[PDB]
Write a protein that binds this ligand. Structure first.
Ligand SMILES: [Zn+2]
Ligand SMILES: [Zn+2]
Lengths: 199, 332, 195, 332
């Protein structure tokens, strides 16, 4: 039937993930240093590659599974910085798999996944709009559990470094506050903020 | 059956002897200015008809006041604009600088020259005897000028008097209820503010004049010198007349509605009773006595009368001994 | 069950507050609205739970929903309206700012146009001072004109204490630790222009 | 059994007579600079080991080149840093300006001085005869200097030669494979790029020296003058030797593995066959003959030899007639 990679990326919540190539994982040089970051490295790798396992302990099989999910995530973060990874993520972006910018004046600009930290545990995955260049929380709550470190701080920045032609124009229009047609002067903010501070 | 007609003792026919376009406000063509000249800074206040903001004229970097007018009958909007312009330049009258519009909603706004946001109701309770005299005189300058130009304010109250105490500068504001005087004309008795409504309004007598303003100015003076705000504190419009009747006495009230043959509300009969004309000295006590003088009491007595025709005109008031010491200092 | 209480209770109408009967019963507050809604007299009757007298009953219902909307837009600019909406804001009924650096700041409903038909309701975050589309799709059918272009701005004019501080932190793009120079967006936009 | 030992004909003991810290790179302490001095502008290129970006030093507004190093053995990182610093300042060697680190992930990056991003595979097929002479000489300056400083580059190829043709400026880049020479040492035969691999690497002979670089420089010169890129176009490492053997002849190859007593990989047995030493004039044709001279052919022949010890040293090469006309112009 299907492969572990194909299963994982298929799960609800894993909509932001692309399918990493076996070539990439089977080349030890690409996974340099990751053995010092995941428990059960040898067995976790085996599960990811659909290789013969080592099952009498029902919870040990679930401990390996976690490590496999963590290692896959950290491989992903490296893989999507490469030409082929970008190529696959770029395909998903052209389909809008990452959702769209909630900013009204961004006019539904498709977004890209970004990590606010490269270390696992610190923050969940956020989304980067290439038009307003700001970072947003996913609207759907299924994406509030995917670790940001599995995408990384530099993915969208690398993508436009590599495919600068895909960078959208700056927004033609801006939000203009009007009250009964009158614009609100900027002194009106300095005056308000004081009233909250002085409070 | 049928009420006795009435006419103003002063400036009765100023409007008759003017071009229609002076008082025919329905026909006034509004010349709109550029809204994008003005940007809001902060909210100054609000009311039944308008929202008011401080703003800045970005062309010359100057402070202005923008009175944003909520949906009403175009008629009422034109009325105010015409009056503000007819009286523009006059003593202690608010200067209308510009008129603007929101292209989309078409919400109209009036732009006035900046006034120091200190209404009578803030300071007029820490004012001295001379201060009350001085400022009361300044109100009478406006009131005489607008009466002489054929207009009755119809909403004189402390919220409608702006005072820059530091510069001894006073402005009579909010002319959204002001109207032109035409002898013989029956007006709407639904004006002013309950506490400042004249008896003629409370009995549904429609042929009133400038003297309405003098009643209201009375109610302000009584409030300031006796230190009781508002002076006549009625719970509804009917009760308001009861409060007045308790001070001025029921005798002069029934004389008043007989002199003018006014059909009373049947429900006024059942709440008014019999009350004596109380002496003005009754309201004097230790906290207020420094503001009460005999001149003050005479002047008050000649303002607060049921008969609108027996009230002092604004010019007559200005001549009262109460202001002698003011008029003297204003002789430099 | 009051019609107002029913309408504000419906799925999608989570942003609306319940308008006071006093406010509607005073004709002066509804000045000019008779020139904007068909079946004004009958629409008003339905809103106020008064004796009525087919598809015509559904035509009135639409007008009642449109008139209620337009009353709402005036009502929430008044002290009491603001008071009610402020209560809903303190509960987060309007949702929260999707901007990461706004740290889930509660938002307020705003209209991008005052005319009905032109745009659906959007949300205003008082921290980043920008405007967003509602995340939930039930709110993509509520007309913006039923809230109006000036609601949030009035609210802070009236209750300036409630204005949040500007965000302490900003998003900083880093690639392998390196910041991205501004001359990189200019070169990136040049290449995209040539295609 | 067992291979005959070998030693470099020049600069054999330069490392022996230097302080350990010169060549003991494992012990080098890296002095990190401030990452926040450098901001990226555009991607210049990539490799197995690195990702390369043009950047700007915001402290002095100057262009730099940032070689971001992917995860490898710390050993390899220190080796490159030490070499780049030992050779810093030298002729036609790339100047290492700074070393920085991502304080979080700890990804190390090398910062070099700006070089015009045109390598050799870019124009070295449209250059004139003098141009090839000129630039070849400039490579020899770097190759002689780094050999004299006891370092073999181990990856000489056109991608690793940066040329600013406008300013006739050349830089020998990418020392991530360079290594220190120690007489007697057995090195890794897994270096270079297939097409530039010397015979010694292809037969698994480990006791090589600076001469390896001279083979590669041969492969470059052959490519440039004959206009065939790459010159020896092998499909795998075994086939690579067959391509070389078809040109240089199998006679000298079997002489070579005998002189040094090298056990051939069993999968060379039936693959090499019997081939004659071909005359260099064979590769000359109408498109290339303007670049081919007798001096060029003699020089090439003395570079591309199976026996690493019979190849010209970088200093010897500089003396060849091929460069007489350059050396004459250079003294100016
Ligand atoms: Zn955006
Ligand atoms: Zn925000």
């Amino acid at each position: 039937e299907v492969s572990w990679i194909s299963w994982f990326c298929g799960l609800r919540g894993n909509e932001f993930f692309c399918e990493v190539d076996e070539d990439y994982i089977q080349d030890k040089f690409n996974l340099t240093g990751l053995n010092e970051q995941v428990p059960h490295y040898r067995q976790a790798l085996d599960m990811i590659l659909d290789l013969e396992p080592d099952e009498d302990n029902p919870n040990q099989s679930d401990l390996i599974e976690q490590a496999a999910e963590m290692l896959y995530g950290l491989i992903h973060a490296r893989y999507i910085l490469t030409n082929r990874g970008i190529a696959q993520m770029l395909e998903k972006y052209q389909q809008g798999d990452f959702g769209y910018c909630p900013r009204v004046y961004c006019e539904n600009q498709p977004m890209l996944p970004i990590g606010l930290s490269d270390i696992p545990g610190e923050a969940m995955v956020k989304l980067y709009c290439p038009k307003c260049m700001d970072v947003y929380t996913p609207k759907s709550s299924r994406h509030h559990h995917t670790d940001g470190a599995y995408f990384g701080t530099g993915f969208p920045h690398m993508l436009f470094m590599v495919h600068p032609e895909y960078r959208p124009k700056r927004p033609a229009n801006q939000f203009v506050p009007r009250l009964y047609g009158f614009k609100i002067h900027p002194m009106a903010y300095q005056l308000q903020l004081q009233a909250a501070s002085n409070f | 059956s049928g009420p006795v007609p009435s006419r103003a003792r002063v400036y009765t026919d100023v409007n008759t002897h003017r071009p229609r376009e002076y008082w025919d406000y329905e026909s006034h063509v509004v010349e709109w200015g550029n809204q994008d000249d003005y940007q809001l800074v902060r909210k100054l206040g609000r009311g039944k008809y308008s929202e008011v903001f401080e703003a800045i004229n970005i062309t010359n970097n100057e402070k202005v006041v923008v009175k944003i007018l909520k949906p009403v009958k175009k008629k009422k909007i034109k009325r105010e604009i015409k009056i503000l312009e007819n009286l523009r330049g006059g003593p202690n009258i608010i200067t209308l600088a510009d008129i603007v519009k929101d292209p989309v909603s078409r919400t109209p706004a009036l732009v006035f020259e900046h006034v120091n946001n200190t209404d009578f109701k803030q300071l007029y309770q820490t004012l001295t005897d001379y201060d009350i005299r001085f400022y009361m005189y300044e109100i009478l300058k406006a009131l005489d000028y607008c009466h002489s130009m054929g207009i009755m304010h119809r909403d004189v109250k402390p919220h409608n008097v702006m005072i820059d105490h530091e510069h001894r500068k006073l402005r009579l504001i909010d002319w959204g209820l002001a109207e032109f005087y035409h002898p013989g004309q029956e007006y709407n008795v639904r004006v002013a503010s309950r506490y400042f409504k004249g008896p003629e309004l409370l009995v549904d007598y429609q042929m009133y004049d400038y003297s309405l303003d003098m009643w209201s100015l009375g109610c302000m003076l009584a409030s300031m010198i006796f230190r009781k705000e508002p002076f006549f504190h009625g719970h509804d419009n009917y009760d308001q007349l009861v409060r007045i009747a308790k001070v001025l006495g029921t005798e002069d009230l029934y004389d008043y509605i007989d002199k003018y043959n006014i059909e009373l509300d049947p429900r006024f009969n059942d709440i008014l009773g019999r009350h004596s004309r109380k002496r003005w000295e009754r309201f004097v006590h230790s906290e207020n006595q420094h503001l009460v003088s005999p001149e003050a009491l005479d002047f008050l007595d000649k303002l607060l009368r049921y008969d609108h025709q027996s009230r002092l005109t604004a010019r007559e008031a200005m001549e009262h001994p109460y202001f002698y010491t003011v008029v003297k200092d204003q002789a430099r």
